[PDB]
């Protein structure tokens, strides 16, 4: 609910973090379009649809491309530190 | 490599299918933007980045919205039948 | 919703089937007390809280003890064929 | 073997903790009826059949109902702190 | 127990099959040195320590090198058809 | 790349660590023959083929037998502390 950036630490035993990302087309930012039930993201209970990913393990994804967001997530290791900012209006305005 | 629709059956024991989807913004179609290592999609070896999802278990996703694509995948059960069509040019043209 | 026995086939890559069982104390039957999100049971969408397990791979669990129900499930292999019968009244009447 | 409460921290990447719970019918307490091979509970090696769950992440489950025990576990996040007390006699006396 | 080749079909949602392999050094054959609890191999209940892998999805591994055995398993897809032959004497004679 | 021992902490929610081990035949040491995609080992990005396992949670595996290496790994719990030393020459010299 907070519009202030949040730090969320997710742990994974396999590649999946439990969410799907969109954006990164032309510097509009990377957003979480949906959370998968039972996965790390779901279990934490902090990440949601509409969240924008500011960074993943220090790597700045604000003006990142989808390909970069994907690479950052892929190499985040088992403990993934996501800084997300809940901004639905923008998500809608840009994707829905 | 084939541009003809392919039927791909993925099996899952948890919510994840092993890929990330984009599109579904304004009827441009749903595409696989990236495959996750070790997941069902990766293991099958048929699905790839650039693939467009024509349908998931009969449900037509050609002109579906991201929200619908997500719901179809969510309720596909354990055996998910995807009909994908490899069209990179369009993926680029529309997302990259 | 049907009170007639249903055959449900769940597939697992690990020990978990995605549900929790109670009963088997004094021949009252084995019941599913809760479904876990993302697991096989959840994904199938057929099994629910209140369901009574008639059998698991031919093994009759009607008048089974909790210990037997556990052993049947443990050795069901990867393809587990459950015959469940939805009877909430009895579940309540006996456990809640 | 100790009858003194033990703190056990289990980590999960999916909903499952690796054990099955019974009780919570009429304030007799929540007990672990069986451990699943390969799951978090099994891997830790501390939790066993006969253990009574005093609490899960501060939430007191002593006189909890099965429904509450289930909700506590469901929302425990990825790091689940269980305080269990090994009391087989009571488990038998009440369930077996 | 049978010394006659057996066909065993394992299903996986992730890379792991649930067993560890040795051999393939100098054409002595590939053997299963240990089974992991809860994994596909364990769940099937057919594969055991001492088993020699004749083939994996038609690919003949009799005189295969460890590197080839690894590649065959890696690309077996989700349904892996193993033809194993239980020969402990040889396993000992060659590895233990 | 470093030939100096490295401490690598892997986390698992199931029995699998994400790698396959060989050796332990006649005190030549235990080595990682291959890494599985998506598993803990792969995700960490530190362990590789050719690595020799000096210890797993203090348990010295230098002159361990395959059976001991297997037992150490089996009981390492969820947080597994591996001290590996990258020595390919020896791996080749002894296995390939």
From Swiss-Prot, chains A, B, C, D, E, F:
Span of domain PDZ: 7-87
Post-translational modifications: Phosphorylated by MAPK12.
Tissue expression notes: Abundantly expressed in atrial myocardium (at protein level). Expressed in lung fibroblasts, cervical epithelial and B-cells (at protein level). Expressed in the brain (at protein level). Widely expressed, with isoforms displaying different expression profiles.
Cystines in this chain: none
Cellular location(s): Cell membrane; Basolateral cell membrane; Endoplasmic reticulum membrane; Postsynaptic density
Free-text note regarding domains: The alternatively spliced domain I3 corresponding to amino acids (636-669) of isoform 4 is an EPB41 binding site mediating association to membranes in polarized and non-polarized cells.
Family: Belongs to the MAGUK family.
Oligomeric form and interacting partners: Homotetramer. Interacts (via guanylate kinase-like domain) with DLGAP1, DLGAP2, DLGAP3, DLGAP4 and MAP1A. Interacts (via guanylate kinase-like domain) with KIF13B. May interact with HTR2A. Interacts (via PDZ domains) with GRIA1. Interacts (via PDZ domains) with GRIN2A. Interacts (via PDZ domains) with KCND2 and KCND3. Interacts (via PDZ domains) with KCNA1, KCNA2, KCNA3 and KCNA4. Interacts (via PDZ domains) with ADGRA3. Interacts with KCNF1. Interacts with CAMK2. Interacts with cytoskeleton-associated protein EPB41. Interacts with cytoskeleton-associated protein EZR. (Microbial infection) Interacts with HTLV-1 protein Tax.
Protein purpose: Essential multidomain scaffolding protein required for normal development. Recruits channels, receptors and signaling molecules to discrete plasma membrane domains in polarized cells. Promotes epithelial cell layer barrier function via maintaining cell-cell adhesion. May also play a role in adherens junction assembly, signal transduction, cell proliferation, synaptogenesis and lymphocyte activation. Regulates the excitability of cardiac myocytes by modulating the functional expression of Kv4 channels. Functional regulator of Kv1.5 channel.
Protein name: Disks large homolog 1
Native source organism of the sequence: Homo sapiens (Human)
Gene this chain is encoded by: DLG1
Residues of the full protein shown: 460 to 555 of 904
């Amino acid at each position: 609910i907070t519009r202030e950036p949040r730090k969320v630490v997710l742990h994974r035993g396999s590649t999946g973090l439990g969410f799907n990302i969109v954006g990164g087309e032309d510097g509009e930012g990377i957003f979480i379009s949906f959370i998968l039930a039972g996965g790390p993201a779901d279990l934490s209970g902090e990440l949601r649809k509409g969240d924008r990913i500011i960074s993943v393990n220090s790597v700045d994804l604000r003006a990142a491309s989808h390909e970069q967001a994907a690479a950052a997530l892929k190499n985040a290791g088992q403990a993934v530190t996501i800084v997300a900012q809940y901004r639905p209006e923008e998500y809608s305005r840009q994707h829905a």
